[PDB]
Amino acid sequence: FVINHGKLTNQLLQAVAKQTRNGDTQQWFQQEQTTYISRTVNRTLDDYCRSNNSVISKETKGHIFRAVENALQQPLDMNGAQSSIGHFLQSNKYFNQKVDEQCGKRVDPITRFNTQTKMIEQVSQEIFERNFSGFKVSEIKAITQNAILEHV
């Protein structure tokens, strides 16, 4: 399927602007960036522990986060796990119209929902990389993997 990430971003930014009055988006940008990146990091850790059945102590988790933090020159938060971009898409008209179109023949409340969550992951990553090029998701993942290797 195809979607105009640019229009989505404008709709996401508009939503952010309702919070204040000057329509500031700076604070939102800062928070989302460290949050999206932190969740990307936590996601990589989850995938690592799952396949290996390993258990990394929160201490070690911190060393990994600081390592990724230094490598990216970006402040992180090891509790990061929910991006407001993905949550924004969840209740966005344009995005959900695409979810429907994509579910096509199927509308088992469950299948539709899973399709929605899968598309939410894909589109927010795309939205993140076009507006937050501090580093790309694949890069963040690789850097993290190298941290896990070094400290785990």
Binding site: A15, V16, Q19, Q27, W28, Q31, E32, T35, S38, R39, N42, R43, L45, D46, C49, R50, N53, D77, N79, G80, A81, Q82, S83, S84, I85, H87, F88, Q90, S91, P109, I110, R112, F113, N114, Q116, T117, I120, E121
Partner: protein, 173 residues
Amino acid sequence: QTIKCVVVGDGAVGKTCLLISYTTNEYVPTVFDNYAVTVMIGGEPYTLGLFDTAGQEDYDRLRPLSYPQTDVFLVCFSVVSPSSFENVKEKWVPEITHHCPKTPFLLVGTQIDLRDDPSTIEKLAKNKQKPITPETAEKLARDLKAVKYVECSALTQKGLKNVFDEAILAALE
């Protein structure tokens, strides 16, 4: 027909463990993805959409984006955390009431399994504090217009399923 249920509250309240414990019906991840489940109530199959807010506790610019279209909120607090119970009245209810004044919410108490733990009462007995009781809990549920008040333990799963049945019940209006 998917009911949107969002879990709000302070960190260290165990919101994530609460959703994972419920959906394990494996490796417990840090990041909980939106999950939907079909629940039977009065012979009718309802689809419950579950959304976590873990990590945004103090990223005030992010939280608002989770609220549009929410059918029911679970405002959580740890029974063994007087500061989390206090933030419900102080931060969470005011926040959801602001963004979703018509949306119902249950007052939820977690980690009731530690309420029966000396170590906790001891290292709670420090700052002149004691675990929270259902009584003191309902009075706040009352004061804040919560639909109801329920509690559970992600750990023991006691009262878990009930929490979510009520969430659905509350949303069905």
